[PDB]
Amino acid sequence: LTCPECKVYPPKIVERFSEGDVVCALCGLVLSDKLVDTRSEWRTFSNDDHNGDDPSRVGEASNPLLDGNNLSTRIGKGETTDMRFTKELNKAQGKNVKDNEVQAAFAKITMLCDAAELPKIVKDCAKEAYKLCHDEKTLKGKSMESIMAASILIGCRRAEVARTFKEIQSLIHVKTKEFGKTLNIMKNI
Amino acid sequence: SFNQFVDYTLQDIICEDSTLILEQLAQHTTESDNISRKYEISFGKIYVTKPMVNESDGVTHALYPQEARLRNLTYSSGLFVDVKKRTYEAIDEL
DNA sequence: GCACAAC
RNA sequence: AUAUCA
DNA sequence: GTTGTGCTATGATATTT
Ligand SMILES: [Zn+2]
């Protein structure tokens, strides 16, 4: 936005949220009137409503960085439900199910962090380190259980969670010199 | 109420279903078949420390109620259980 | 948990 | 979602 | 005869993931 009347290069404008207006601080011209509360709007996606009574709660938050954009609900039991139709509609989801399956290597990272007592911020860095280096030609053919063992120390080394390489050698697995070279070809990327 | 749950109830919850076993019985063709095994996993005494905290830099130390309220931590203590893993085997009852 | 509406 | 207000 | 299907006071305010 830039005031149509004034036009000074550093466009000094204020967001008078309380009056729901966007004003030019110099001439006072209102540049916009429709203005939305982003906090409360975000409350509609990530709420505390797990029961299902909130009429405001109408969407859900996702993580486009880690799981791409895979929107998908799950057939489950409701109040008035026969245990028959749940099974059929779930047995029908089985026929509809390669790299769209290597996302189960996130389940390998998640089950490793929880076995290593690691926080929720470390898993999401280990999952982003693994997604951006598992199909690299720079890693080529490294021990596939030692490149995800190296991306956990990459996620810990940014989230400030102290984990020695010998601490991850105890988890899995690690071949020392094998997951030490792999911890460097990724570090360049 | 809570004390009764920690001193008694907790142990009995660890001991009701408790032990779980997995049996691997062979095809009885010939070696390396004809080997029937049963593995055990058992849960004994349950321990419970004084409240502690696991900081980001590995170090674990005691945690008082005031530090919990200020650093928004949880005033929890560690649950430890004695585990035992037995192994058994038979050929093609004992 | 109503109370009335259709199978 | 709880608590609450007349 | 049984099942099955709508709804069940007005507004307000304060936290908790
Ligand atoms: Zn202006």
Dist CA A128 CA A106 (whole Å): 9
Element (H, E) at A32: strand A30-32
What are phi and psi for residue B21, nearest 5 degrees? -125, 150
Q: Would you give the distance in Å from CA B70 to the centre of its chain?
A: 32
Spatial strand order in the sheet of A21-24: A13-16, A21-24, A30-32
Dist CA A14 CA A22 (whole Å): 6
Dist CA A151 CA A172 (whole Å): 12
Dist CA B56 CA A175 (whole Å): 26
- Please, which residues bridge with residue A67 across strands? none
Dist CA A156 CA A160 (whole Å): 6
Which residues of A are annotated binding-site positions for Zn(2+)? Answer: 3, 6, 24, 27
What are phi and psi for residue A105, nearest 5 degrees? -85, -10
Residue type, position A20, single letter: G
Q: Which nucleotide is nearest to A47 (CA to C1')?
A: E17
Structure tokens at A145: 């259980």
Give the resolution value in Å: 3.6
What are phi and psi for residue A75, nearest 5 degrees? -70, 120
Compute the residue count for chain B: 94
CATH topology of domain A1-189: Cyclin A; domain 1 (1.10.472)
| Residue entry with tokens 């290069």 | A9
Contact B54 A161 (CB under 8 A): no
The answer to whether the beta carbons of residues A148 and A130 sit under 8 Å apart is: yes
Give strand D nucleotides closer than 7 A to any protein Cβ: 1-2
Q: Which nucleotide is nearest to A53 (CA to C1')?
A: D1
List of chain A residues whose C-beta atoms are within 8 Å of the C-beta of residue B52: none
Dist CA A47 CA A54 (whole Å): 9
Pairing of strands B60-62, B36-54: antiparallel
Tell me which DSSP letter residue A17 carries. G
Dist CA A128 CA A113 (whole Å): 14
Tell me which DSSP letter residue A94 carries. S
Residue type, position A130, single letter: Y
Q: Is A7 left (phi over 0), alpha (psi -120 to 50) or beta?
A: left
- Give the distance (Å) from ligand 1 centre to CA of residue A31: 9
Dist CA B14 CA A27 (whole Å): 73
Contact B56 A160 (CB under 8 A): yes
CA atoms within 13 Å, Cβ hemisphere of B70 = 5
Residue type, position A132, single letter: L
Q: Quick check: A43 CB within 7 A of strand E?
A: yes
Q: Is A99 on the interface with B (CB under 8 A)?
A: no
- Give the distance (Å) from ligand 1 centre to CA of residue A12: 8
Pairing of strands B87-90, B77-84: unpaired
The answer to whether the beta carbons of residues B34 and B91 sit under 8 Å apart is: yes
For chain B, where are the E strands, in sequence order? 20-24, 36-54, 60-62, 77-84, 87-90
Q: Quick check: A160 CB within 7 A of strand D?
A: no
Q: Is B56 on the interface with A (CB under 8 A)?
A: yes
Structure tokens at A172: 């899995």
Q: Would you give the distance in Å from CA A11 to the centre of its chain?
A: 34
Dist CA A90 CA A84 (whole Å): 10
List of chain A residues whose C-beta atoms are within 8 Å of the C-beta of residue B54: 117
Dist CA A160 CA A180 (whole Å): 20
Q: Quick check: A48 CB within 7 A of strand D?
A: yes
Dist CA A132 CA A153 (whole Å): 15
Compute the residue count for chain A: 189
Dist CA A125 CA A152 (whole Å): 8
**A72 Cα to chain B: minimum distance (Å):** 34
Q: How far apart are the first and last CA of chain B?
A: 46
Nearest Cα to A133, choosing from A120, A146, A114?
A146
Dist CA A51 CA A74 (whole Å): 16
Pairing of strands B87-90, B60-62: unpaired
Dihedral sign for Cα atoms in the order A50, A51, A56, A57: positive
Q: Would you give the distance in Å from CA B37 to the centre of its chain?
A: 23
Q: Quick check: A47 CB within 7 A of strand E?
A: yes
Structure tokens at A97: 């199910």
* CA B31 vs CA B22, B26, B36, B49, B78: distances in Å: 21, 10, 12, 49, 47
